Design a protein around this motif. Structure first.
Motif, mmCIF file in Angstrom:
data_model
loop_
_atom_site.group_PDB
_atom_site.id
_atom_site.type_symbol
_atom_site.label_atom_id
_atom_site.label_comp_id
_atom_site.label_asym_id
_atom_site.label_seq_id
_atom_site.Cartn_x
_atom_site.Cartn_y
_atom_site.Cartn_z
ATOM 1 N N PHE A 275 -1.940 13.004 11.657
ATOM 2 C CA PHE A 275 -1.152 13.632 12.599
ATOM 3 C C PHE A 275 -0.315 13.110 13.364
ATOM 4 C CE2 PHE A 275 0.098 16.551 16.445
ATOM 5 C CZ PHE A 275 0.833 17.203 15.793
ATOM 6 N N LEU A 276 -0.681 11.740 14.098
ATOM 7 C CA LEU A 276 -0.250 10.656 15.102
ATOM 8 C C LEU A 276 0.836 9.884 14.007
ATOM 9 C CD1 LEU A 276 -3.085 10.302 17.371
ATOM 10 C CD2 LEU A 276 -0.873 11.540 17.423
ATOM 11 N N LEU A 277 0.309 9.456 12.676
ATOM 12 C CA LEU A 277 1.090 8.186 11.406
ATOM 13 C C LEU A 277 2.696 9.029 11.377
ATOM 14 C CD1 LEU A 277 1.230 5.263 10.926
ATOM 15 C CD2 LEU A 277 0.432 6.378 9.094
ATOM 16 N N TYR A 278 2.353 10.091 11.433
ATOM 17 C CA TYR A 278 3.615 10.922 10.578
ATOM 18 C C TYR A 278 4.424 10.720 11.547
ATOM 19 C CZ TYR A 278 6.082 15.128 8.519
ATOM 20 O OH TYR A 278 7.339 16.194 8.460
ATOM 21 N N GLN A 279 4.141 11.510 12.711
ATOM 22 C CA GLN A 279 5.430 10.961 13.875
ATOM 23 C C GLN A 279 5.379 9.664 14.636
ATOM 24 O OE1 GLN A 279 2.720 14.216 15.848
ATOM 25 N NE2 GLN A 279 4.650 14.702 16.875
ATOM 26 N N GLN A 280 4.644 9.080 14.353
ATOM 27 C CA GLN A 280 5.281 8.018 14.907
ATOM 28 C C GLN A 280 5.709 6.342 13.707
ATOM 29 O OE1 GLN A 280 1.014 5.955 14.904
ATOM 30 N NE2 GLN A 280 0.459 6.678 16.906
ATOM 31 N N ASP A 281 5.702 6.536 13.228
ATOM 32 C CA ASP A 281 6.410 5.789 11.641
ATOM 33 C C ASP A 281 6.468 6.537 10.699
ATOM 34 O OD1 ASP A 281 8.138 4.390 10.173
ATOM 35 O OD2 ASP A 281 6.412 2.509 10.937
ATOM 36 N N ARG A 282 7.173 7.183 10.308
ATOM 37 C CA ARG A 282 7.412 8.692 8.833
ATOM 38 C C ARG A 282 6.777 7.587 7.228
ATOM 39 N NH1 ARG A 282 9.143 13.556 7.481
ATOM 40 N NH2 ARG A 282 9.540 13.850 10.033
ATOM 41 N N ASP A 283 8.031 6.120 7.664
ATOM 42 C CA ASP A 283 7.180 5.151 6.647
ATOM 43 C C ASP A 283 5.872 4.862 6.100
ATOM 44 O OD1 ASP A 283 11.115 5.137 6.370
ATOM 45 O OD2 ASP A 283 10.661 3.207 7.031
#
Ligand code: NA
Length: 158
Positions: A133-141
């Motif tokens: 959930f956090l990574l999706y928001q932090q940097d979708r790449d």
């Protein structure tokens, strides 16, 4: 048993017609004798064109005698890096929630197709797993890089 009658019907109809690359079977009894109609072992292929393509994702479906009033608990047997999959493996999805969008008429095929679609379409309103959930928001790449890598790891074993 209304539950077992329905499950036998779902299994029979599944064997007649189901989407390619999917599996939905009774799981083996723990003592080795026969099959457990109340616990299915399933497999979902990543949808073509999406991040999960090429992978095969095993999942259990656990039913109770209150089925079909109560939805099955659907659990990936290896947790996937996805915002809506709990650390337990349980799929967080509104059609699988008794108090939300579950209906007794929902079929096994509709459940598996719904979960396949969820993989490609994370829901930001229902976070179930902190890191994706956090990574999706932090940097979708970076999210995409991690999911593609996991999809390769879930290719059927050679
Ligand atoms: Na796991």
């Amino acid at each position: 048993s209304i539950a077992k009658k329905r499950l036998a019907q779902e299994r029979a109809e599944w064997r007649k017609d189901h989407p390619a690359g999917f599996s939905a079977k009774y799981s083996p009894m723990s003592d080795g004798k026969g099959l457990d109609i109340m616990k299915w072992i399933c497999k979902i292929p990543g949808k073509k064109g999406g991040l999960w393509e090429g992978g095969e994702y095993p999942l259990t479906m656990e039913f109770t005698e209150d089925y079909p009033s109560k939805p099955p608990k659907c659990k990936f047997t290896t947790v996937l890096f996805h915002p809506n999959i709990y650390p337990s493996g349980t799929v967080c999805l509104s059609i699988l929630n008794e108090d939300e969008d579950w209906k007794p008429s929902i079929t096994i095929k509709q459940i598996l197709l719904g979960i396949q679609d969820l993989l490609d379409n994370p829901n930001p309103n229902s976070p179930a797993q902190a890191e994706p959930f956090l990574l999706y928001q932090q940097d979708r790449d970076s999210y995409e890089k991690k999911v593609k890598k996991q999809a390769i790891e879930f290719r059927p074993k050679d």
